[PDB]
Design a protein around this motif. Structure first.
Motif, PDB file in Angstrom:
ATOM      1  N   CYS A 558       0.832  -1.323  -0.020  1.00 52.11           N
ATOM      2  CA  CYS A 558      -0.014  -0.004   0.066  1.00 52.11           C
ATOM      3  C   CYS A 558       1.110   1.270   0.268  1.00 52.11           C
ATOM      4  O   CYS A 558       1.436   1.569   1.025  1.00 52.11           O
ATOM      5  CB  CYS A 558      -0.959   0.046   1.226  1.00 52.11           C
ATOM      6  N   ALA A 559       0.927   1.804  -1.171  1.00 53.69           N
ATOM      7  CA  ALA A 559       1.752   2.901  -1.056  1.00 53.69           C
ATOM      8  C   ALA A 559       1.021   4.263  -0.357  1.00 53.69           C
ATOM      9  O   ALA A 559      -0.107   4.627  -0.508  1.00 53.69           O
ATOM     10  CB  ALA A 559       2.064   3.694  -2.742  1.00 53.69           C
ATOM     11  N   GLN A 560       1.775   4.755   0.488  1.00 51.39           N
ATOM     12  CA  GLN A 560       1.267   5.988   1.593  1.00 51.39           C
ATOM     13  C   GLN A 560       2.278   6.657   1.915  1.00 51.39           C
ATOM     14  O   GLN A 560       3.375   6.403   1.761  1.00 51.39           O
ATOM     15  CB  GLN A 560       0.571   5.139   2.590  1.00 51.39           C
ATOM     16  N   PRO A 561       2.026   7.912   2.292  1.00 50.07           N
ATOM     17  CA  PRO A 561       2.999   8.860   2.791  1.00 50.07           C
ATOM     18  C   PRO A 561       3.413   8.623   4.018  1.00 50.07           C
ATOM     19  O   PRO A 561       2.985   9.192   4.960  1.00 50.07           O
ATOM     20  CB  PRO A 561       2.513  10.169   2.625  1.00 50.07           C
ATOM     21  N   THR A 562       4.003   7.591   4.455  1.00 48.91           N
ATOM     22  CA  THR A 562       4.580   6.848   5.575  1.00 48.91           C
ATOM     23  C   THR A 562       5.564   7.636   6.176  1.00 48.91           C
ATOM     24  O   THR A 562       6.215   7.311   7.271  1.00 48.91           O
ATOM     25  CB  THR A 562       4.661   5.289   5.676  1.00 48.91           C
ATOM     26  N   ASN A 563       6.177   8.462   5.662  1.00 53.05           N
ATOM     27  CA  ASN A 563       7.571   9.297   6.133  1.00 53.05           C
ATOM     28  C   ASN A 563       8.729   8.223   6.307  1.00 53.05           C
ATOM     29  O   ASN A 563       9.284   8.508   7.517  1.00 53.05           O
ATOM     30  CB  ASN A 563       7.132  10.258   7.260  1.00 53.05           C
TER      31      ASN A 563
END
Length: 966
Positions: A558-563
């Motif tokens: 899941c591509a997410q802005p997880t920093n």
């Protein structure tokens, strides 16, 4: 175009709605910008953290510095939430809880400050909650009858009979009775009292039972006029909403109606002792030992510098974590594995709640003869830490742990920020310096690189040479609570003897008017509110991709802005596991990453876990199917977290855990099992309603039975039984059997949440890891009574309903929340006196009733029966249905962190199509559908009931033959 860029556009010296921009700092490590404002007319300080997160949070803080043990800020905080001038209805807090789209709304009172935070996602709802909080806190009706009902009064046991003697009643009065029964609260409070005997920390700020009836209504109003004044206030907001709306609302609703005062409330510094001291206190007995009486807690505490000087506090906090956190700490190796006690003392480690922070260490559960032995051990360990110092890897593990806590994306970030800066800000510190964490890390690394024995000089300076040392011991006495009862009854009789007959008729009339106030249902139509047109009709679709890999493991990316973080999850079923070995699964999950793997001992394994990951844990989960009441999946969720650079090391650690775990290291395992058994025994009251519902719900579905096995009271009692066995080796032999049945790839699925820029490297590391690893129930009624040594009761009633995908489920959910808002709250809480009570419907299909700290038993179940009769009566309007829909859509649309978006598809297998279908089913709920579903499922004789009781002995329950006693 963005919010944080415009938040960086705030220039110095701008005047905005009566506020003045004093300071603007960018915090790039946290993707937020701090702005400090001051109101010109009032002097109230404003700190806003603007960050692109939709879960916006507001909080307001008042500095309350009591000078006596009357408990005035705790009762004033309780009374200020009971009504205001513009909103004269009772309890705006709970009333706005069902008229808003909030995710959190509560208030806290520490020793020297009061805090009112909330968080919500809708700007109009933000305007709504901010207006209700401003008018509730700053302009309450300070009615005398609210002070007599919630605080202290003399009242007859029956207010209509003027011949029975007078007793004390009150919410805060019995809260302080229950605080005084708590041994940890006596220990913590007296520790602060003896260590800080000069000023406000020497008294019980929550209220001393002997000093509480000295508080007058006139003192309550004077304290409110002096301390709940905006010049004694600190406003804090967090999130992406435009500030101008907030500042305009604050100025136009609250701040204009006051004029400047100057609080003379600064807390002076504690005067340093010349000589260490010892004190002995007493607490209440417990069920651990009679003749041996090992229930003796001892501590040694040291005074530290102030929280104002940020750097020295940050350094000493890291030092205390090095000294106390984990089995690689000196004090663990010296004290825990010494076999003299049971656990660390309360308030162990760095305690920064007071003005001057303090360090505490000690043990609880020791024999009283070993007190001087413990004191010598603590001194000897300080000598050894001075002589040997700390290894560099543990320092690197701590710096990597604190940095990973900095970058981690939670759902309640603003609440953690306001709780993390409230204590420092309360004593006139600069809160921005606690935010510039990167600078403190850089200075920490540089100060270690210049002097390799710096921390040895710190431990010497603040521990061996610290003359403000306190050794405090506690031993229980059989004649304690009756001595306290004697002196309290004596204060009662001395206060009763001076009262005239005119005073007794005043008591009689005040009691009858208080009973009328407690009985009459009041109107809340003066509150502003949202409508169903303000609820979003559709949710944004979450994009997923499932890839079967090596050679049949599905892996979800899941591509997410997880920093820059990789969050790995894996769920392995247990369908092949023998049924005898089922109850020891949670124990396995709690110890799997704590026993050693391969060439790593448990000390090195814990060091590696803290050095490479941010924590790796396993916990069992039971995920019900959404289309069959009698279908469920049972398994274990492995969860981990790491920075993007430590990912191959993390997967090397995971492979080492899966391929060669060391189930033979017995001593630390014995320590951990006694520690978890103690922790579960300590946690029964705070989750009593959860344990009551989970035991109550065992008999409806197999999923309930598995939840009972993994997390019910059976698990705690079994864990205690295992912790009482003297030979743990035959129990330890069961763990390779769990390794051999669960750690393979036959029935597995995995998840990876990471940045899309990092995703192919994560796909490579995971495929390497996966190639490197091995290869009709009928519900039946049950009534249960757990005899617990508690002063209050916990009862649970369950009714079997439809699962999630049935169209009646959304209507039942609306009905349950409706019943909670409009019947059960008034009947159980206002009438009964309990702190918590309501109705809930779970995702599997269990309609569950619960009680939290309820003084009654039979009357509560009778109120449940009257609630179901109320539901069949249909006596609710369409606006009540809109309110219940508002509360349910406030619950289901709670914000999800980037690490769990989307986790629900990974666990329960519910697509966004199923969520959209259920959301439109919640939209379609009507009044006649609620009466139809009430006559179809909640009616008597339509489904099977289940009952459970946590609480003290009650003879009337014992004479019922339909109950089973535990």
């Amino acid at each position: 175009a963005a919010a944080c860029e415009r938040a960086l556009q705030y220039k110095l010296g701008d005047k905005i709605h009566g506020f003045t921009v004093n300071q603007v700092t960018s915090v790039p490590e946290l993707f937020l910008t701090a702005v400090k404002l001051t109101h010109d007319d009032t002097g109230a300080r404003y700190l806003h953290l603007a960050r692109e997160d939709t879960n916006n949070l507001f909080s307001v803080q008042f500095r309350t510095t009591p000078m006596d043990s009357t408990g005035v800020p705790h009762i004033l905080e309780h009374t200020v939430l009971c009504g205001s001038q513009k909103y004269p209805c009772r309890d705006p807090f709970f009333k706005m809880l069902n008229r808003s789209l909030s995710t959190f709304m509560n208030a806290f009172t520490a020793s020297d400050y009061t805090l009112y935070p909330f968080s919500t996602q809708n700007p109009k709802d933000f305007q709504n909650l901010l207006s209700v909080y401003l008018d509730a806190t700053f302009f309450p009706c300070l009615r005398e009858l609210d002070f007599w009902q919630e605080g202290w009064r003399l009242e007859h046991e029956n207010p209509s009979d003027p011949q029975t003697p007078l007793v004390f009643k009150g919410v805060v009065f019995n809260e302080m009775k229950g605080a005084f029964t708590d041994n940890e609260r006596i220990f913590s409070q007296h520790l602060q009292n003896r260590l800080l005997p000069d000023h406000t920390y020497s008294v019980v700020s929550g209220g001393d039972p002997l000093c509480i009836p000295e508080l007058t209504w006139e003192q309550l109003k004077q304290f409110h006029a002096t301390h709940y004044h905006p010049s004694n206030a600190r406003f804090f907001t967090y999130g992406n909403f435009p500030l101008e709306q907030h500042l305009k609302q604050i100025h136009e609703e609250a701040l204009s109606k006051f004029q400047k005062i100057e609080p003379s409330t600064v807390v002076p510094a504690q005067t340093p002792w010349d000589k260490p001291r010892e004190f002995q206190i007493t607490c209440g007995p417990d069920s651990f030992a009679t003749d041996p009486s090992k229930q003796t807690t001892v501590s040694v505490s040291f005074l530290l510098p102030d929280i104002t000087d940020t750097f020295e506090a940050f350094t000493l906090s890291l030092l205390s974590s090095l000294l106390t956190s984990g089995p690689n700490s000196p004090f663990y190796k010296a004290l825990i594995e010494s076999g003299l006690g049971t656990d660390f003392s309360p308030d162990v480690g760095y305690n920064g709640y007071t003005r001057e922070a303090y360090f505490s260490v000690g043990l609880q559960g020791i024999v009283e003869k070993d007190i001087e032995t413990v004191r010598s051990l603590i001194d000897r360990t300080i000598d050894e830490v001075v002589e040997k110092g700390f290894e560099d890897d543990r320092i690197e593990a701590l710096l990597h742990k604190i940095e990973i806590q900095m970058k981690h994306q939670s759902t309640s970030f603003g609440l953690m920020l306001t709780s993390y800066i409230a204590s420092c800000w309360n004593h006139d510190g600069d809160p921005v310096e606690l935010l510039k964490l990167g600078n403190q890390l850089a200075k920490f690394r540089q100060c270690l690189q210049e002097n390799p024995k710096f921390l040895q000089e710190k431990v010497k300076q603040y521990f061996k040479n610290n003359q403000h040392k306190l050794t405090l011991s506690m031993r229980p006495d059989d004649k304690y609570h009756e001595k306290q009862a004697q002196v309290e009854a004596t204060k009662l009789k001395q206060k009763v003897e001076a009262l005239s007959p005119g005073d007794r008729q005043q008591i009689y009339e005040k009691g009858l008017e208080l009973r009328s106030q407690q009985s009459k249902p009041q109107d809340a139509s003066c509150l502003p509110a949202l409508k169903v047109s303000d609820i979003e009709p559709t949710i944004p679709v979450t994009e997923l991709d499932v890839v079967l890999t090596a050679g049949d493991i599905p892996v979800q990316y899941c591509a997410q802005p997880t920093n820059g973080m990789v969050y790995f999850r894996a769920f392995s079923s247990l369908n092949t596991l023998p049924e005898e070995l089922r109850p020891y699964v949670p124990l396995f999950c709690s110890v799997l990453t704590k026993l050693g793997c391969g060439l790593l001992d448990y000390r090195e394994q814990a060091q590696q876990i803290e050095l490479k990951t941010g924590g790796m844990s396993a916990s069992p989960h039971v995920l019900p199917d959404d289309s069959h009441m009698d279908t469920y999946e049972q398994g274990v969720l492995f969860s981990s977290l790491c920075l993007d650079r430590n990912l191959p090391d993390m997967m090397q650690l995971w492979s080492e855990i899966f391929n060669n775990p060391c189930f033979e290291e017995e001593e630390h395992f014995k320590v951990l099992v006694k520690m978890t058994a103690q922790e579960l025994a300590n946690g029964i009251p705070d989750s009593g309603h959860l344990y009551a519902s989970i035991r109550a719900g065992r008999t409806l579905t197999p999923a309930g039975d598995l939840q009972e096995t993994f997390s019910g009271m059976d698990q705690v009692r079994l864990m205690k039984r295992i912790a009482e066995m003297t030979d743990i080796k035959p129990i330890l032999r069961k763990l390779p059997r769990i390794k051999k049945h669960l750690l393979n790839g036959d029935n597995m699925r995995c998840s990876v949440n990471a940045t899309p820029q990092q995703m192919p490297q994560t796909e490579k590391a995971v495929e390497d890891f996966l190639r490197s690893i091995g290869r009709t129930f009928k519900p039946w009624q049950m009534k249960t009574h757990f005899l617990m040594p508690f002063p209050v009761n916990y009862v649970g009633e369950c009714i079997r309903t439809v699962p999630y995908t049935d169209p009646d489920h959304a209507s039942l959910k609306i009905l349950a929340r409706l019943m909670t808002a409009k019947f059960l709250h008034t009947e159980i809480r206002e009438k009964g006196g309990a702190y918590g009570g309501g109705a809930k419907l779970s995702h599997n299909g269990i309609f569950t009733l619960y009680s939290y700290r309820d003084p009654n038993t039979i009357e509560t179940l009778q109120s449940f029966g009257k609630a179901v009769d109320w539901a069949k009566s249909g006596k609710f309007t369409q606006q009540d249905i809109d309110e219940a829909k508002l509360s349910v859509f406030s619950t289901v649309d709670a914000p999800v962190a980037p690490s769990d978006k989307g986790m629900d598809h990974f666990l329960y297998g519910l697509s966004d199509e199923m969520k959209q279908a259920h959301r439109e089913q919640l939209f379609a709920v009507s009044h006649d559908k609620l009466l139809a579903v009430s006559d179809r499922y909640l009616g008597t004789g339509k489904s099977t009931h289940g009952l459970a009781i946590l609480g003290p002995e009650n003879p009337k329950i014992a004479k019922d033959p339909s109950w089973i006693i535990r």
